[PDB]
Amino acid sequence: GSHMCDAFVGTWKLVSSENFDDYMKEVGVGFATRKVAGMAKPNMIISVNGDVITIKSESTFKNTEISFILGQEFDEVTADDRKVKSTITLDGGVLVHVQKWDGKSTTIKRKREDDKLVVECVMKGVTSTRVYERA
Numbered sequence: 001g002s003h004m005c006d007a008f009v010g011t012w013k014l015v016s017s018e019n020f021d022d023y024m025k026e027v028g029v030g031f032a033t034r035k036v037a038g039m040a041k042p043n044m045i046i047s048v049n050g051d052v053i054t055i056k057s058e059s060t061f062k063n064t065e066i067s068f069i070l071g072q073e074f075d076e077v078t079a080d081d082r083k084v085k086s087t088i089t090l091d092g093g094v095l096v097h098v099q100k101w102d103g104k105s106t107t108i109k110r111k112r113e114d115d116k117l118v119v120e121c122v123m124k125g126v127t128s129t130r131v132y133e134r135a
């Protein structure tokens, strides 16, 4: 039983980052965490089992893992240790991840573009783009 979200499945390694420090400032991440998180070169491991999608990240900074069903809110601990309420949906082929905490919101979009997985993170008007390639 294939699904469209199978284009995301696999092991991905970070190959470029743009404006991540500024995005983290807008989110409210402190200096020391920004510096060490910004240095990280995570791998992201995406898998699907039935209706459950898992996204795991492994890095020298932190390892994180989320499992979820599309459209069903869950509580998430982020790499920077926010406790957030998250919902992830598929909108036209893009995984759209909204995180809410403390009256604030940020959106992380994940899309396949050529052989890359492109992650766009937006907090108010600030966008960071993080590009992954297959490991």
Ligand SMILES: O=C(N[C@H]1C[C@H](Oc2ccccc2)CC[C@H]1C(=O)O)c1cccc(Cl)c1
Pocket (backbone or CB within 6 Å): 024, 027, 029, 037, 038, 040, 042, 044, 057, 058, 059, 061, 062, 063, 064, 078, 079, 080, 108, 119, 121, 130
């Ligand atoms: O989950 C991680 N990355 C994702 C979600 C991040 O959210 C953050 C917001 C503020 C501070 C840090 C992260 C935004 C960037 C995303 C990406 O895919 O690159 C991740 C996991 C382990 C280590 C590290 Cl450095 C990042």
